[PDB]
Amino acid sequence: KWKTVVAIFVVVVVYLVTGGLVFRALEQPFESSQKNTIALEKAEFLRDHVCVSPQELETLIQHALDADNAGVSPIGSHWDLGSAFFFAGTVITTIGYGNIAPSTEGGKIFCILYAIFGIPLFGFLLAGIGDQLGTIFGKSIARVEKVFRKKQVSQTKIRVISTILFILAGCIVFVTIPAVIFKYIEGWTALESIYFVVVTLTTVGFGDFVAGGNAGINYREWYKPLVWFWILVGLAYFAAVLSMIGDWLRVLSK
Amino acid sequence: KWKTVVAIFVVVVVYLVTGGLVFRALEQPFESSQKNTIALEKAEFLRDHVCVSPQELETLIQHALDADNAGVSPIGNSSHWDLGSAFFFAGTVITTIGYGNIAPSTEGGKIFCILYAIFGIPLFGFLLAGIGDQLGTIFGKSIARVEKVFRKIRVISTILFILAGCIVFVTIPAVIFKYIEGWTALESIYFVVVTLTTVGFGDFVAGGNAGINYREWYKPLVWFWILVGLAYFAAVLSMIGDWLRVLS
Ligand SMILES: [K+]
Ligand SMILES: [K+]
Ligand SMILES: [K+]
Ligand SMILES: [K+]
């Protein structure tokens, strides 16, 4: 119904206006801070180095940015058999970190066709893992559900206890335990690790934090595909969690 | 069934190995080219400018990168967190596109983004399902008018919907982004596909240029296109999924 479509639209538009105001309240002071810091650092380089013109400076910065955009650090491979495999995975899962992206015209063309047919192909694997996890957790939850049924507990509370039991159990295995590993391996903060997990498993994938992206960290070859395996089982868990939040939002709608 | 789950896994693993080899065949020679280009550009700067030491060169390059990571161009008044630009950022999280050209740098901004995504993505799901049902009624009533003419079929209707929607949601907006943002014909189509599949690399982001001073009607209209375009692409990717299930 169009009447209900307009209602959800008004809620979403308000939710975005609200979100945007909270984000600028938390981010605009830091943005202004970095805007002034680069203004000062560029101005002090032209003071200290008189043999450098303001135009020659901008040309160098542009050359450094062009290199960084291409996935090459302008300080001091991303397409190796393993790193390219994980890139492909990032496209198929719709995460799209963008820390690396195709620069070649042909690379962009192949990326279009690869995503179009690859994303539905993953959909089957994600639905398959989703059904398997629903059988593993489903059998474990039923064992607990039978215990409360004997205790004359209401059908309401049992379903509530089960929903909190599944979320809490999976949150340990797919969110907490991997974030502890990323905090130690990648060397991020407790917040930045949880932030990476949520941003990854929601398929948002900003690319500010990417597992196995540090030049200084020389971790073994098994880490990159193991991260992709965590993603595979973690996306199925998060899909169920986001579906339950949707289900609870439908309850609040009625 | 687990027997079919392992089968799809083997297909996906092969598809990734294949994909990775095609991507490196197209990208690794250019990567090596840019690796040598920055090496020579830095070496030429230190030759032409003797008053600059190799240490103070890396320090500025580092300062420039730090600024770019924070979403501030180290080139050359404009903001990324203004009422309108922050609204589009919120939209990017909710649609799961996540361009990442801008992302929260604050610990609090990161905390709020976790909660915002968790409750916001399902909220969008309803709006996307609602637009999906409405488009299915608009395109469904228009296809039935043509279907009645030939009766006096399902394959002919699928080709008609894909071609019609591809003009309205992919072709026409790509032409606008090529003129407004100033991208190539390829880069505009590439941006549209990367955006409407919710991949969102962030290499190309509408309303991201510092030099381009587009009005307050540009940034929200882009999200309005994202809103109706995601519903179209969701149906297209569902049909490709349906077609693959037939081949299975
Ligand atoms: K990104
Ligand atoms: K994404
Ligand atoms: K992304
Ligand atoms: K996505």
Curated annotation (Swiss-Prot), chain A:
**Site positions (pH sensor):** H78
Q: Where does K(+) 2 bind?
A: I95, G96, V204, G205
> Where are its TM segments located?
5-25, 109-129, 161-181, 226-246
**Effect after changing L242W:** Reduces norfluoxetine inhibition
Cell location = Cell membrane
- Binding locations of K(+) 1: T94, I95, T203, V204
UniProt effect for mutating A101P: Loss of channel gating by extracellular pH
Q: Which domain of life is it from?
A: Eukaryota
Q: Where is this region: Selectivity filter 1?
A: 94-99
Segment Selectivity filter 2: which positions? 203-208
List every range the entry marks intramembrane: 81-107, 190-221
- Which amino acids does the record list as binding K(+) 3? G96, Y97, G205, F206
Binding positions for K(+) 4 per the UniProt entry: T94, T203
Q: Which residues lie on this side of the membrane: Cytoplasmic?
A: 130-160
Q: How does it assemble?
A: Homodimer; disulfide-linked. Forms heterodimers with other 2-pore domain K(+) channel subunits, such as KCNK2, KCNK4 and KCNK18.
Q: What is known of its domains?
A: Each subunit contributes two pore-forming domains 1 and 2 which assemble to form a single pore with M2 and M4 transmembrane helices lining the central cavity and M1 and M3 facing the lipid bilayer. The transmembrane helices are bridged by the selectivity filters 1 and 2 carrying a signature sequence TxTTxGYGD that coordinate the permeant ions. Up to four ions can simultaneously occupy the selectivity filter and at least two elementary charges must translocate across the filter to convert it into the open conformation.
Which family is it part of?
Belongs to the two pore domain potassium channel (TC 1.A.1.8) family.
| Protein name stated in the entry | Potassium channel subfamily K member 10
Record organism: Homo sapiens
UniProtKB/Swiss-Prot annotation, chain B:
Residues engaged in binding K(+) 4: T96, T198
Source organism, top-level taxon: Eukaryota
Q: What is the effect of changing A103P?
A: Loss of channel gating by extracellular pH
- Residues binding K(+) 3, per UniProt: G98, Y99, G200, F201
> Where in the cell does this protein reside?
Cell membrane
Residue(s) at site: pH sensor: H80
Outline the segment boundaries, as ranges, of region: Selectivity filter 2: 198-203
Binding residues for K(+) 1, per the UniProt record? T96, I97, T198, V199
Q: Enumerate the intramembrane stretches of this chain.
A: 83-109, 185-216
Annotated K(+) 2 binding sites: I97, G98, V199, G200
Give the stretches traversing the membrane: 5-25, 111-131, 156-176, 221-241
Location of region: Selectivity filter 1 = 96-101
Chain positions carrying an annotated carbohydrate: N77
Q: Which residues lie on this side of the membrane: Cytoplasmic?
A: 132-155
**Subunit arrangement?**
Homodimer; disulfide-linked. Forms heterodimers with other 2-pore domain K(+) channel subunits, such as KCNK2, KCNK4 and KCNK18.
What is stated as this protein's family in its record? Belongs to the two pore domain potassium channel (TC 1.A.1.8) family.
Task: Tell me, in a sentence or two, what this protein's role is.
Answer: K(+) channel that conducts voltage-dependent outward rectifying currents upon membrane depolarization. Voltage sensing is coupled to K(+) electrochemical gradient in an 'ion flux gating' mode where outward but not inward ion flow opens the gate. Converts to voltage-independent 'leak' conductance mode upon stimulation by various stimuli including mechanical membrane stretch, acidic pH, heat and lipids. Homo- and heterodimerizes to form functional channels with distinct regulatory and gating properties.
For domains, the record's comment is: Each subunit contributes two pore-forming domains 1 and 2 which assemble to form a single pore with M2 and M4 transmembrane helices lining the central cavity and M1 and M3 facing the lipid bilayer. The transmembrane helices are bridged by the selectivity filters 1 and 2 carrying a signature sequence TxTTxGYGD that coordinate the permeant ions. Up to four ions can simultaneously occupy the selectivity filter and at least two elementary charges must translocate across the filter to convert it into the open conformation.
What is this protein's name?
A: Potassium channel subfamily K member 10
Section of the entire sequence shown:
68 to 326 of 538
